Design an enzyme around this catalytic site. Structure first.
Site, PDB file in Angstrom:
ATOM      1  N   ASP C 182     -80.135  11.597  28.847  1.00 40.27           N
ATOM      2  CA  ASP C 182     -80.276  12.985  29.249  1.00 40.27           C
ATOM      3  C   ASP C 182     -79.856  13.908  28.133  1.00 40.27           C
ATOM      4  OD1 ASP C 182     -80.793  15.316  30.548  1.00 40.27           O
ATOM      5  OD2 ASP C 182     -79.533  14.908  32.288  1.00 40.27           O
ATOM      6  N   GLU C 212     -81.277  24.996  29.087  1.00 37.22           N
ATOM      7  CA  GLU C 212     -82.394  24.493  29.875  1.00 37.22           C
ATOM      8  C   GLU C 212     -81.973  24.233  31.309  1.00 37.22           C
ATOM      9  OE1 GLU C 212     -85.520  23.961  31.315  1.00 37.22           O
ATOM     10  OE2 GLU C 212     -85.961  23.809  29.170  1.00 37.22           O
TER      11      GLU C 212
HETATM   12 ZN   LIG Z   1     -82.325  17.473  32.753  1.00 35.81          ZN
END
Ligand SMILES: [Zn+2]
Ligand SMILES: [Zn+2]
Ligand SMILES: [Zn+2]
Ligand SMILES: [Zn+2]
Ligand SMILES: [Zn+2]
Ligand SMILES: [Zn+2]
Lengths: 353, 353, 353
Positions: C182, C212
């Protein structure tokens, strides 16, 4: 029709029909086990607590082979006025197994009258009409007497008196057996072992303990006189291959091989034994599983606590259903179990380290 | 940076990284404890059950010092077809502590592969989307294998095989330690005690018992060969100073002093010992608390049941968090605990009454 | 042991251990990405918002390659009096992943102290003793300080400060990787792409966007200076092949090939791109899946909204677990992903229509 003569259909009848709590007025099973075992063993004795002690003699360490013979039953606690019985269970039983036929009442040895136990009346409510589970208070039993006086004239009194009335029938005439499992399949292995064992490379002591299902330390009492320096067990508790379940229970039983216990609630088997039996079954082409539970109380746990600090392995003859009512087994596993223990006993002399 | 040299940062590493159920293929901890202790003690022995027995010799009563080395772990029970593992816990663990990183699988000694265990899929329902607690069936583990065949080629088999993968780090560089607590902080006291004890005014027997967290009577087996006429214990179980709680748990731990056990579920300590230790800590300016629980099963309970009827006190090294994952301690308490026991042992000769 | 040298085990270490919210006092990841990429690219720049901009030059349309580097973390909001921390999460995290070990606190660059976050005390009630899910208020963190004063002397202050303390280990030594996924697996593709790309048939702009996981339009800011006339993305959000589930999630990941996004919550990829990549993977014998979600917010959605109205496809490197704690991947997919994008970029000149 003993096409193979692997499991004697006659012998299993004698043990399992007999009533499954000893020392009481039902104690005939004691006579049965000694009536068989004694011809093949040097000497046999009965402890104070109803335990049975069979001592084959030899040259080697003292091995202890433990099976339980305390089949589940029920106890009358009082007599309602209409001649109908209430009851109190012995530990382990599930009450959804109330009856489909014939609860048996052992007033005394060789005297039995049939009884039924179907229904505690469910309470009066609409969500409870959906809950057809019996109330926890406990279920009631009928023997057809109209009054308390009539019931005592039969011979019924307060006490632990009752059992399940099983009978042994053959399903899957290729291979399986109906009620042969609980509290005497292990003994059949023991008895078959005693016939199969000739050359005692280690001096073994076969015990058949009582009060296993309640106060598992019942077995412990026998231990101290007998055990030291090694130990074994043949008890069982399983949830086996019931359809609609995932695969996580399927390996516990598939109809194949015997079951070695690594872990239970109570006991953590000394793993050297386990790896050894694993090695052993491969050498003689014997089938085996490796089974563990999250719960259940076995004889082995009580063995671990004697003063020497004994290491213990345990074998299991699998494929039970919820142990009250029917108790399916596999002809293959039980004979395989016998082979395994038979070889392990003789080869125990090398195991010592 | 041992500014004080009170607690050896190197020594704690050796014991705690090691795997926490002995006798299995992981049994290296046994070697570790004896590899250290033996240079300072006259003789040492291993019982059958994996217990360790260290016998320093002297003139006086027989004192028994009990710590547990059975750190919690998990067990594989079967192998699903996609190469992912299910599991069954060892007693005591809470499943909300599923993982944040790195479950370790000890196939054999010196062979480990990392594994993860994050998520049983929650059932499909709207109140249950709110219940993010795992299902009780139990959680599953991943080792990345695609199939059952690949998994067994690694070496994974059924058995008790798994542990938590802790590593020891320093928080509050002034003073605290992260995972040093459970199933080996007591041993560090024992080892530190053996270094600090020179003149044996009483003949002590240090034991490090197994199967404490499951079947606490595992410790008992060692007892009978060793115990008579006195007893001690160093085990722990705490709910410590978690914020948002009332003050009724705060005295169980505040980051100060050691913890004497008056009561637990299992054991009721012979209070003369307690008042004596209370007297002792004041004489040498040692800090102490008095802690009690409503639950928990310690080694001391098993000691009380040996045939002599032994009186027992118990010390506790406090400040645990829910014992699975991280296990904070206080550098002050552990060294204080050592001082206390060290003096108690030598002064036990006057305690006899 | 890079038997294949497909994925550099050293390189992944540098990026993923670094802390995953940039611009803060932790901002070292920024240096890391530019420290690598710059030797292979003509020029590189940093925007105001912490975005990174790498501009390789060429002859063709402007292609935008987007990855996120905002790994999830937690934020201290206040300091209780006992020296223990409360926290507030960054968007996306699930609180059942409280801890199993070692939450890390990045006071400043190159200064970290370990912390634990195990337990908010569950409320006092009987259905809630069954609900072992944490309360929604949020969990608490411990760094071992006894007081607020001691905590600030360490350097802890209010701010977004905390992360998860992952470390990269190899499971399935044949092939898989533990925490590599991730917020940096995409970057490894980008970096590997820059090494593999020699002949710039289209002028590409590699971006590594911030913010994000919270305010996905963080990426958008970089877009306008850079994007026009085409766009790509490499982000992920998956529920992958967890056993006990039906087959409807299994195709999302099986341990095979890369994942093209047709649909998400936010973005609907211009399907010509999809059919083209489908065509492309077959021509070069590349593996591919087609994945869609019902939820999740990716970088691609923000790209679609820039003034030109850009068409966008998105690649996904699959096989995540619930993104907090462990983040399994497949060595095969990531290298395959690189191959696919590498060829797509060069062949984009024919795609224009
Ligand atoms: Zn993510
Ligand atoms: Zn039971
Ligand atoms: Zn049973
Ligand atoms: Zn317990
Ligand atoms: Zn414990
Ligand atoms: Zn989101």
């Amino acid at each position: 029709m003993e096409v193979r003569n692997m499991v004697d259909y006659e012998l299993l009848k004698k043990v399992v029909e007999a009533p499954g709590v000893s020392g009481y007025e039902f104690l005939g099973i004691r006579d049965v086990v000694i009536e068989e075992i004694k011809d093949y063993v040097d000497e046999v004795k009965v402890d104070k607590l109803g335990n049975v002690i069979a001592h084959k003699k030899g040259e080697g360490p003292k091995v202890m082979i433990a099976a339980h013979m305390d089949q589940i039953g029920l106890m009358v606690t009082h007599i309602e006025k209409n001649g109908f019985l209430r009851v109190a269970p012995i530990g382990g039983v599930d009450p959804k197994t109330l009856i489909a036929q014939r609860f048996k009442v052992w007033i005394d040895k060789g005297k039995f009258i049939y009884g039924v136990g179907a229904s505690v009346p469910p309470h009066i409510q609409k969500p409870e009409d959906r809950k057809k589970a019996p109330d926890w208070d406990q279920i009631f039993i009928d023997i057809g007497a109209e009054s308390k006086e009539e019931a005592e004239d039969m011979g019924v009194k307060i006490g632990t008196v009752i059992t399940w009335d099983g009978r042994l029938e053959r399903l899957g005439k290729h291979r399986f057996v109906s009620i042969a499992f609980d509290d005497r399949i292990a003994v059949y292995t023991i008895l078959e072992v005693a016939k199969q064992l000739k050359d005692a490379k280690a001096d073994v002591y076969f015990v058949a303990t009582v009060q296993e299902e309640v106060g598992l330390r019942g077995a412990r009492t026998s231990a101290f006189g007998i055990e030291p320096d090694y130990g074994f067990a043949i008890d069982v508790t399983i949830a086996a291959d019931i359809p609609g379940t995932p695969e996580h229970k399927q390996v516990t039983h598939l109809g194949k091989g015997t079951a070695i216990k690594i872990m239970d609630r109570s006991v953590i088997c000394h793993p050297t034994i386990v790896r050894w039996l694993e090695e052993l079954a491969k050498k003689h082409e014997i089938p085996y599983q490796l089974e563990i539970l999250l719960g259940g109380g076995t004889d082995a746990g009580a063995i671990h606590l004697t003063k020497a600090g004994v290491p213990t392995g345990a074998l299991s003859v699998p494929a039970r259903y919820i142990h009250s009512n029917t108790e399916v087994v596999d002809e293959r596993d039980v004979d395989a179990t016998v082979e395994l223990m038979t070889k392990a006993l003789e080869n125990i002399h090398e195991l010592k380290i």
